[PDB]
Amino acid sequence: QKLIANQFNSAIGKIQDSLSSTPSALGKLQDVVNHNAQALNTLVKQLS
Amino acid sequence: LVKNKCVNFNFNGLKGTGVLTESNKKFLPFQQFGRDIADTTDAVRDPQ
């Protein structure tokens, strides 16, 4: 029980670093955001 | 010159409709109009 609990706790502790450290970790959600922004900016720029 | 109120305006033939406000744009003596990314005049130097 104690070893399993400690392994879980250390693994959960490393998630903060893994997300914050590797830049392209949230890349799928950032991709959604960027696609919307890019499409609207393209629409605006097409008015010229 | 009416400011801060939606008006039809005509500046040296540049016709439009909107609210005119005092600007902080740093124009240069050879510039009469300022343009946005859509190629729409969004800042104008008053002729007089």
Query: What 3-state DSSP class applies to A35?
Result: helix
Residues in A closer than 8 angstroms to B37, CB to CB, are 44-45, 48
Closest CA to A44 of B26, B31, B42, B20: B42
Torsion angle (degrees, nearest 10) of CA B10, B16, B22, B27 = -80
* Strand ranges, E, within B1-48: 7-11, 14-18, 33-35, 41-44
DSSP structure string for A2-26: HHHHHHHHHHHHHHHHHHHHSGGGS
Instruction: Give the whole-angstrom CA distance, residue A26 versus residue B25.
Output: 38
Distances (CA, A) of A46 to A37, B37, B42: 14, 9, 17
Q: Confirm if B43 and B31 have CB atoms less than 8 A apart.
A: no
Q: Any bridge partners for residue B41, and if so which?
A: B35
Kindly report the nearest CA distance between residue A48 and chain B, in angstroms: 5
Report how this structure was experimentally obtained. cryo-EM
